[PDB]
Amino acid sequence: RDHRKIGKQLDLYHMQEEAPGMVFWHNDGWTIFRELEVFVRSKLKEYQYQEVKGPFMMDRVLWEKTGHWDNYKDAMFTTSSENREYCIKPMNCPGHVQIFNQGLKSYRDLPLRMAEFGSCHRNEPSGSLHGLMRVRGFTQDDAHIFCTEEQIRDEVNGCIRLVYDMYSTFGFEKIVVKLSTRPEKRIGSDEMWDRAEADLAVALEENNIPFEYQLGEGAFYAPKIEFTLYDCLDRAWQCGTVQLDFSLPSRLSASYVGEDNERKVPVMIHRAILGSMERFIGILTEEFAGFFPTWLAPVQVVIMNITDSQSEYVNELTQKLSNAGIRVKADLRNEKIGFKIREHTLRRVPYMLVCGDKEVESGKVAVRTRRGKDLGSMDVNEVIEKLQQEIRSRSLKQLEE
């Protein structure tokens, strides 16, 4: 039930000591990564988010300006070029503020929702690294919302709604919500922190979401609402987060022209719904015990013959399924049908199609699932249509399940 064990079994990824905390995504694991990206992008379109891409490294002087250098130095990778030192970004907020600062912004541009699948690199202590859940290089489903003070309630509510919307796709039953308050090392006045912490609490209360306080776990610039998911050992892992920030836009000279034609500093909301793709995939691997939902499965269908007599038929079906958009593979090895079924069941392939002379002649397929069920024979076109519905709807359950 360990995601590291399942990851090796399904050939999802590997790690080596030439790059501690750095993930080598194999073809099958990268497929899950990219499917989550498509799923997130469908939500970004629905909730009207921009998607951008910031540079990997920026000058150290900018990270000093944000207060990151003083409160985050130990976790930052640095490099140099031409007598100038750069920081590999551990966060995407300063890059998004730089994009916001291009061109004059007015209140008609707010709220401005700017998302990124941003690569973050943090020099986490090597003793704390754990599989995919704690790594040194990860990709956040990050976004930053620039808005007025009057828009805070609506935008924070939208982030909370998005969290439960996207978590419901995976059928999570245990979602623990925490409000992380000010840490010992922080910027911003006590009055600002009181307003920011109260705003997040009111938003949670308004949505009728029970939560507990997590004292001192907030960011150095803003408090956090934390959505916690649990692994196989029931250990708590922070995945969802929404942050209410009154300080960083001022530090980076972000401003917009208000209704009064007076210059105003926008409020910034930081949020990551999945958290990081690496940690969320690890949580998904242990939650499903490798039985990924069909829309997430690296290989959705395996088609396989009894002898050569059905080998040509299998190849035609694999091409037909592939043209229909289904991740399908052919297993034409000289092995017993039970041998093939057991191997691909270990690979957690959702559906295995068995082809004898009976099916070759009838144009049908014998259907078997990774759960050991025998679904019998039904027509190829019916199988295609049901699989497409299961994939497009991102259904959690298989056929007749």
Add this chain to the structure above:
Amino acid sequence: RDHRKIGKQLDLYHMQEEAPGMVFWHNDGWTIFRELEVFVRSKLKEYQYQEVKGPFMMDRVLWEKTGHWDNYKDAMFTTSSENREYCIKPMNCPGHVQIFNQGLKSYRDLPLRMAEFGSCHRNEPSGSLHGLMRVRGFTQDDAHIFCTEEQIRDEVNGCIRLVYDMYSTFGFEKIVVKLSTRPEKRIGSDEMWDRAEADLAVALEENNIPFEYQLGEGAFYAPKIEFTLYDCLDRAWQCGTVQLDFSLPSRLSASYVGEDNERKVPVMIHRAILGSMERFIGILTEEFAGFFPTWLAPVQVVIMNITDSQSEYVNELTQKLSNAGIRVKADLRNEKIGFKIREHTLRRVPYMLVCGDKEVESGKVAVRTRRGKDLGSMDVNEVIEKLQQEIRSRSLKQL
């Protein structure tokens, strides 16, 4: 027709001195980036490529083994962690070999085509930086093909076929091909370079490709076929490259079990079709002067109302076009309709849909293009199908 000027006008990207040679991709520019990713992925499924993702940095000992540290040192970004050096990867080849080395490989696994949109970082001299053409951080449509010696001809032929297949989508008329031979500083024996250079020369001639030699411009590990495209002032930019490598797999302990059950070292072919996304987007921007083809346009359709009376009707169409897979925006601002049209025309939006009272009553829409062509009232579903066909076929011209 300078891409830096067009990129500023169209809000595609920006660059700052706090991050020299590093691109801030804005929403509209990142849309073009992602569309090229979709285009490349569609082709790579056709040619049966894996897609992987290597990590950002690896131990400097790795780059010593490949010879990169001796032949590529000054152009590499380096960092530190717990008394160890790490190299920000300037290439994706060592990472792909590491994935190849996971698990036993046999001849039945070859040719193994392993692709990645690999982020590369190179410390290019700051005086050589130029817009999107030459940057310090870029993404290559990279891949490495592990194959046998007998499979070299077919695999290199497939790489060349891929280059002209994907380039024909953009209608490039001038594609200049060069064969770069052994540099001064290189690894591998002379005999291997003789064979590798001859193999690439034979492939170019067999493919009816006229080419010129570029002596000493090959990689320190392999010769390379270079596909050259030209910017607005006809400056030569290397985008496509095919590299034949007989040395790196051995240095990185790559091997497979042959048909004879003997350990054998695979041949590696390095290839990038577009080159880098940053440089190719720059080429496209100057080639089209900001008039991106509809499948590439950041915003394909803008629907505007003349007054408030049609504001609802515009919203329903915007949802209906968006549900059809079209990047569409509604312009309901309190501005004159002529003001709205001019703004989106200057943004090179391919199609602009104007909705008056007669459009609402008839369920139609008035269509005009960024080139000033007026297409009159057209049925809404006729708009969508024609738009879908234009995006589907990746057509160069508006129908």
